[PDB]
Symmetry: D2
Subunit: 295 residues, 4 copies
């Protein structure tokens, strides 16, 4: 046998960082979960019990905290690039570092209509994520995303005109509920290294904001012909607004809300135009994906 | 042997309801998860395979949907009282109905600074709950709560002066992070039946709002001596602002954020006043509870 | 306002212990999650920021580990009684200790038909639990349980003869799938203190084994008239076999498996006696409970 | 813009199937969760609201149940190949089907030492999985796996000799706990179509059994130099025992169990050779991966 691929490191590293403005008293907090996986000339740790090539995963953990102490942790695209670059430069035999960061929300509280200097609320489990691949000789590849954005519209979704054959029982509809959990990813042009990532730092938060804005507005305003058609509209606009993005990926479940026929009970009318009470379905769910790039 | 207690019913009943304003086009959605458990003269279903006393749990499910079709589902205190009252009045041998409702957030979206008529976002997993116990001959007992409200303050928490003996290693501190997931419950005076619950309908949403407001403001503004002292302040104010509440209960985890000593690395200073990077601890956690009532 | 009830402590304390037999080389492992909550003359920590009455929850944590170091952690009824007794005896102002223990499975591996001296597998998420309430002047109250025991029978469950009215749509059946997750609790006679708990130590593992055995055999062999009737049979036998148990509680979900009518497709017959493919339902679910005691 | 990739279908489809032996009364049950995602000439559903190219995901659901009714659901490699082949043959414009199946355990109960004909227990959350990619013109690519296999050894794990620099604090050890959740995948040689998959049907269950056996025995018997070295041993043996496998992948977390220094308390000795009580760490965790193929 032979090792064909190998990577190893530390997962689920929870990190908090606070910034304290000494002049204003305003504090700002950041919280993330980090994974770093290394690749390189490490195959002998697998085949020959040669631990000399292993940067201990506990040391990877230490390095995450030390890097957060010495560097900004925002935007996460930059933090991840700094972290990944560290491993490939520090260790001659480590040739790639794969950095995944999940950013958790801590939104400043408004108390009596005024922003509080040190109190925060988690307004949802929506995450902002990055996957940063730092590869010696091949620059830095960054995928940015939002996930866990849960939305519902109560009308202005339709689904008709689909293929009908002997496997088909679904009725066409011209008015249904549409609910999903948005997973949206934008893939940046390859960067040649940390300097180039730094040169674009303002674009990371601005593109996250654009993606979020475009997602919500397109979902709210498109009288949707299908999940497929709505998500493509989202992706085309994000590409039109940031030319340093090469592709946009969406992965969207269709979380079904079924009508409930109550006509067996006292002739109760609860379908079609009279539909008021629905049964949300936990499973199964449609799953719709696409990757859109530039023509 | 003998049956000492017995209750049965349907759990995890997901329910959605939409209201459509025909004049304005504005739609409003509600989503909940409901459990109804019945008690009564049902012991022979257990001891003698006498299913004649069983209102099938599938029929309990049907009844939840039918009740939601015919009645408002908000505030949940009212919906639960209507539902529970139905079972004890409909069925001579059913003497208590226990109704648990978890309300899920669907907050109207703001698109370009304007509220959207039919699009909603789940801004957090925070829940609004009720437990309604409808007992023949004993009225309706309602416990209202909020849960899953996750908060953090980055300073203005302290913990010193606690008992110190041979089991103690914790250092006193005058400045620490405090983070918790708030579970707060207010217990109403017994209501004599559905009419009395209806007579107080506006107080249910207003008291939920007060509890939420008081929780957030007290957490943000109290320079906390302990979780115990902060939560008692919250409970006293809620009791002062709604005299139809008899008790307030809080259950608060202390989700620890540990300092990380980095001085072993190049003399890095990351403790005490220099503490910037912390390690959030998934477990264990302090757990602090109290029930406060009127003197 | 006034404090009506208060308890506090440390939750989610994960504990592992190993026993090493020096002569045979055989090692045995135990893993649990522990919660200890204390009550007593602690109200001033809530009302007057008097932390002097607080045994720090970090010290409660230390005490759990120290107690596990110095004492057997099996059976958990004993460990919990030792732990709870410690707090009420050590601290004059602490008058009750509430100890919850969840025991995780580590079953010795069989390698080539022979038991391995130090290798273990988690054969399921089934738990063995205890709730031990140590109350000064009132002895030690122990509730023992098993939970997470997931079972299915593919026939020899029936459900007919239930109440039928205008809310009823369920069809009677004489042959259905029955699947549940068993939560079974046995409540011991009050013990006067640790000596009495110690005097009964062999009965704790033996009664857990009986409960488990009786549950599985009754589920497998009863041609069930209803969940209610089957669970009552289980509880009566456990009471008959351990006279130091005062009550037995079961809480059983009915995890439904729905038939799928495929006759719309090429006249496929998949219902009734031809039922082969089913759709397991994640929600809703029946929930059936009872507490059985001695006549 | 342009669609670069697109796939869509139905996820989280829960399926149960029973086989009833008419002669012996013995019933056997199977339960899985299925995802089917289709690719093909479907881009106009995204770009032009052309739903005519969409095989509705509800119809994909129907097709899963119909296929389970008409075909064996075991081994899952075969079921998945039948299912995927159906879509690419039935629909001219569908050119790939991606089938993921998670198989849930239902192990026959032993009641009084004898196998029960229709009663089953879920002995763990360990899963058996397949990923089957049916691609027109390119055959059928199958990845088989086991996941969720949770194990612990209490000694005969070591970790020393690793790189030590200014980021390193971990102490070398010659005796530690090793615990992991095994995710192991074996990748079959490409099959030219369903006939070739059928020709190998006995090898699917036998190779799953070998992988499981080899994993457990290697974990139990290797005095492990590192997770890397132990997992490579597992993968080499599986490749040696099934020549129709091209690669083996392992993904193994190192779930840490930390020693607890109790010497601050009455000189208690709980480290090194005296280590008896440990604190299992929920996070972070090492994560070690490798893909092994043939030299
Ligand atoms: Na390098
Ligand atoms: Na009644
Ligand atoms: Na005491
Ligand atoms: Na095709």
């Amino acid at each position: 046998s032979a090792v064909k691929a190998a990577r190893y490191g530390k997962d689920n590293v929870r990190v908090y960082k606070v910034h304290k403005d000494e002049k204003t008293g305003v504090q700002t907090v950041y919280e993330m979960t980090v994974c770093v996986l290394l690749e390189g000339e490490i195959e002998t740790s697998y085949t020959k019990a040669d631990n000399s090539v292993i940067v201990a995963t506990d040391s990877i953990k230490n390095t995450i905290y030390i890097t957060a102490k010495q560097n900004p942790v925002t935007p996460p695209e930059l933090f991840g690039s700094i972290l990944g670059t560290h491993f490939i430069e520090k260790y001659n035999h480590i040739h790639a570092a794969h950095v995944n960061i999940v950013c958790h929300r801590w939104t400043r509280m408004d108390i009596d209509g005024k922003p509080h200097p040190h109190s925060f609320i988690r307004d949802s489990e929506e995450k902002r994520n990055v996957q940063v691949d730092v590869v010696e000789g091949k620059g830095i590849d960054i995928k940015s995303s939002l996930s866990g954005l849960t939305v519902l519209k109560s009308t202005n979704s339709q689904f008709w005109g689909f293929l009908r054959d002997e496997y088909t029982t679904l009725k066409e509809t011209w008015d249904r509920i549409l609910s999903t959990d948005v997973d949206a990813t934008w893939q940046w042009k390859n960067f040649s290294g940390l300097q180039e990532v730094r040169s674009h730092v303002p674009k990371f938060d601005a593109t996250w904001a654009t993606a979020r804005e475009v997602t919500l507005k397109t979902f709210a305003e498109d009288n949707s012909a299908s999940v497929q058609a709505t998500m493509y509209k989202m992706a085309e606009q994000i590409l039109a607004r940031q030319q340093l993005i090469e592709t946009v990926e969406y992965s969207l479940p269709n979380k079904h809300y079924f009508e409930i026929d109550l006509s067996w009970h006292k002739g109760l009318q609860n379908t079609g135009k009279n539909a008021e009470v629905f049964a949300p379905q936990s499973d199964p769910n449609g799953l719709i994906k696409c990757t859109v790039g530039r023509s």
